[PDB]
Amino acid sequence: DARRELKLLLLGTGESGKSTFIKQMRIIHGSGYSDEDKRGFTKLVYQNIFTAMQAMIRAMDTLKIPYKYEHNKAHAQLVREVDVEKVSAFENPYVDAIKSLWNDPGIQECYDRRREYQLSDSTKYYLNDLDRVADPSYLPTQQDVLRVRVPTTGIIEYPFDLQSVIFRMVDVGGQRSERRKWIHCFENVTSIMFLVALSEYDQVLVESDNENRMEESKALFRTIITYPWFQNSSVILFLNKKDLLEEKIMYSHLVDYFPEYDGPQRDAQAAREFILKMFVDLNPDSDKIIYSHFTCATDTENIRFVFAAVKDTILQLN
Amino acid sequence: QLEPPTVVETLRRGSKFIKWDEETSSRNLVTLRVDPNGFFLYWTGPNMEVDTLDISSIRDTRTGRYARLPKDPKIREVLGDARLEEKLMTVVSGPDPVNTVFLNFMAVQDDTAKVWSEELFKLAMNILAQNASRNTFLRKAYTKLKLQVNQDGRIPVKNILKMFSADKKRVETALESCGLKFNRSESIRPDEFSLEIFERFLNKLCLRPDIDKILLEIGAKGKPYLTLEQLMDFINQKQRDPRLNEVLYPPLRPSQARLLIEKYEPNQQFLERDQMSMEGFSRYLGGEENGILPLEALDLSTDMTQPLSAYFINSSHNTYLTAGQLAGTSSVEMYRQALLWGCRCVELDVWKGRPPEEEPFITHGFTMTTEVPLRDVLEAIAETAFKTSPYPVILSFENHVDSAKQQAKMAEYCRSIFGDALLIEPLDKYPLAPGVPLPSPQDLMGRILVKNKKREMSTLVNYIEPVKFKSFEAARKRNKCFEMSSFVETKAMEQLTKSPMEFVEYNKQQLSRIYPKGTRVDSSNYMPQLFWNVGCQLVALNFQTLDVAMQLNAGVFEYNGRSGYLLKPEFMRRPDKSFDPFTEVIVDGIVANALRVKVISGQFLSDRKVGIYVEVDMFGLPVDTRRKYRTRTSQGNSFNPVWDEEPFDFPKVVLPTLASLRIAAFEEGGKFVGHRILPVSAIRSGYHYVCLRNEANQPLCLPALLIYTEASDYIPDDHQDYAEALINPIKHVSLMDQRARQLAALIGE
Ligand SMILES: Nc1nc2c(ncn2[C@@H]2O[C@H](COP(=O)(O)OP(=O)(O)O)[C@@H](O)[C@H]2O)c(=O)[nH]1
Ligand SMILES: O=P(O)(O)O[C@@H]1[C@H](O)[C@H](O)[C@@H](OP(=O)(O)O)[C@H](OP(=O)(O)O)[C@H]1O
Ligand code: ALF
Ligand SMILES: [Ca+2]
Ligand SMILES: [Mg+2]
């Protein structure tokens, strides 16, 4: 009956996890996803697959990559004329077309350079597992729902009735245009929860093709914590996508994008900590302890372990 | 897949009908056609003179049973039961529900009327056609001239003078400069009257110093040319809605801007270098891409899966009445006209039938008004209910039939005439229990829902049981969404000013119907916005009276594909949220907006030299509602008035989804020219033509305004600097880290 309600803010640059995290809340704490709710995502997964492939097809022209196998030019022309908005089925010839494209070394080499254009971070996850998706009785798994991509806009609040307290978490859009709207959720904020894609260290924004994504996230975090609305607010910092860092850090070197890095190459742990340091260290206009956490928002158990802790930190301070 | 209007070949080449007439009994064999673009239904009748019907003015097409039958036996002698009536077509068209004319045709051929009727309707109710670009409405005028020709096929000059009758001395000098004929007594070969030449006639007729000004503004000091990137930067920076995501709604790429040059620029010397001229730019301004609205708005692109109480519903009060309350006609046609126009709640004041036939009939509370039998009204609903919208139609009864024999009859009349549509038991998913929400519009598609009092007519009631409202406390105690209550205007106003928030909360689960006070004897309307602000769904109005109030209603319900249902704002639906409808300051969670409407110019606004002024009003929450703005009346010019005006600001729109901008032009004296309702949350930014509309929201052709809108998200005064840093943090933090690094040596230690 008489529960207290606290209001948390999911803030970050675009494509960092905010919405995914919210799903994990809905799974762990919220109502979850019934098999009914999963069929709603089937269209979205189909669209993702096209979008991802069309992105790579344009990138073959942009980056000037030859299609290894001749007949894929025909497949390439088939998939690129599709309007993804009107997609609601994954039947032939498109299933075989995209599979045939995904198999092409030229398309694979284009994937190896996804840094140089805008490609989603669930593309390999989906495009490898096409057979399960092509299936005409296909029902997306819980992980399929987590990996799906749907850009957020405006200000959405999601309450979660946890036993002791209710968390009105407010998901927002991360892109630059969206940040103008953020002020209309700044009143009476218990805690800010900032998400940062650890993987974005060598990537440039969608809205700006010449500016580094982490440089922006970093800069955004430093600004946002020193705002009048957040005097009496804790600041949890989620450094997300740790799995992608471990994966990427083998070939792309952090030294090349942040020249004030002193640790060794191909070491994921050293790099994630540098990035944590970058965000919190040497801040003259900040005096609040920041409770960082290395998250992977697509890993239900990691988030179940992580957030249950963040809860005990928030309630303690209130 | 909202496809544009296509005229099938049967309508292009045409078919032979005999246009007959109830009144004068004029039999004329004619060939009905439709022009390629689908603007006009036309036919040659008397001797050789061409009649045109403007398809945008078509309200309904009827065939078979529903085609008006010839009462006069003299005509019916010339004509000739089932297969005879199979080839009848009645076209209904008019500027409002009340004033409609009927054009009865009959085909000579078999099952031909059904193709014309159905296709004429498809064109008449087409959405892109109603929301056509400015250039398309200009091309519609070109067509009308090329259609209506004399008996020897030529375009007479005196129609070009009729169309542009404002300054006929200018139209003469316009036509001479093109090389066309300019005397009132002579005509022009269709051959010689090219669209390209008509396009040049328009240019020389009306100078665009406003568009010249806009070209200087953008950049081109050397004005007669414009680079591709310039256009791109203009389109991306000035013509783009800034409330939108850069990923979901990307900016224009140069390749896309190239396709716009090829689409519009006439000069091949500019086009070869990827550049644009005033002509091409002016063409683009009124182009298919540069509308004031995005298609989504107009399209049926709203969620329809929410409970029925979560929607504003288009509603009629005493639908049967055509003019007055106390004395006036009772028409069955109005039910047709209401439902065809997207009304989803129509009222029926049923009364106890006399002892000869014992037939239930409809009329006003024993006033000086005529009568129509119930049986007929139900047949009219059956016909038109879902003709323009697949979503449920609530039947607002007002039963004054206390005889059991007629009660069982009118229930049969409902059962037999509607059949499968009529919802008689509750659905499996939504029982009539406590704690159950109403079914969604989606779930009740193609269902008639009766709203009648209880304790045979009651057993039909299920999801809309009316009850005598005690209080918002008593309603919450019960927690039954299937129950609802109607409220007379003044009693609704009482609950509005006293219990505004409890009203919203009530409306989150259950339905409130609202009708005008009984003292509005001349069918006067109350502002429906007043009760949409507290979430009232069924705000009933008099459709016969097209004042400002109905203009709004008709205007706003257009959106969401003329479905009749409009989704309420998030905070007026969600149980866990709450806010004060009388709030004078922004609500947290709701992104407020700020609007900047500026009236630049207007073209072909009236058919006689007169001064013209333009109003800019907003309708929303009381804090949003500001309706006192007005331009200065132009100096007796109607062709191309150019208002050198200060911008009309709306600095804080608290709840933009509820907010609706209204732009209306008037003659000096106050005579209505044309209006437009634009949803504030959807309206675009930069320079756009606002093609004006009549009071019943029918698209007018030539009267259009040019406006400059700015519609961004709201930023308070003190928090302007803070916002800039959220939008571009690298800049701010970069300076701070530089300042500190410049102080490096000086600190030391
Ligand atoms: N591999 C991986 N992908 C992630 C992780 N977190 C989020 N994503 C994906 O990155 C994309 C962007 O996530 P989203 O929550 O939409 O970002 P938002 O715009 O900040 O809400 C989605 O496809 C997610 O599935 C992660 O920890 N690892
Ligand atoms: O049209 P008028 O002349 O204003 O008459 C009223 C109006 O038709 C209401 O809709 C009706 O309530 P319903 O919503 O129940 O039809 C009411 O009857 P009531 O007061 O007996 O309910 C009438 O007095
Ligand atoms: F890119 Al987002 F929510 F920040 F989809
Ligand atoms: Ca009535
Ligand atoms: Mg998101």
PDB file of C-alpha atoms and ligand atoms in Angstrom, chain B residues 317-318 320 347-349 364 396-398 513, ligand 4:
ATOM      1  CA  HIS B 317     -25.902  15.184 -30.970  1.00  0.00           C
ATOM      2  CA  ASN B 318     -29.477  14.904 -32.296  1.00  0.00           C
ATOM      3  CA  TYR B 320     -31.521  13.708 -37.266  1.00  0.00           C
ATOM      4  CA  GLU B 347     -27.995   9.917 -31.563  1.00  0.00           C
ATOM      5  CA  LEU B 348     -31.551   8.619 -32.069  1.00  0.00           C
ATOM      6  CA  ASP B 349     -34.472  10.126 -30.110  1.00  0.00           C
ATOM      7  CA  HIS B 364     -37.420  16.179 -31.253  1.00  0.00           C
ATOM      8  CA  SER B 396     -26.672   6.871 -28.708  1.00  0.00           C
ATOM      9  CA  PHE B 397     -30.336   6.087 -28.126  1.00  0.00           C
ATOM     10  CA  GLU B 398     -32.812   8.241 -26.258  1.00  0.00           C
ATOM     11  CA  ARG B 513     -20.630  11.547 -23.201  1.00  0.00           C
TER      12      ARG B 513
HETATM   13 CA    CA C   4     -31.632  13.709 -28.238  1.00  0.00          CA
END
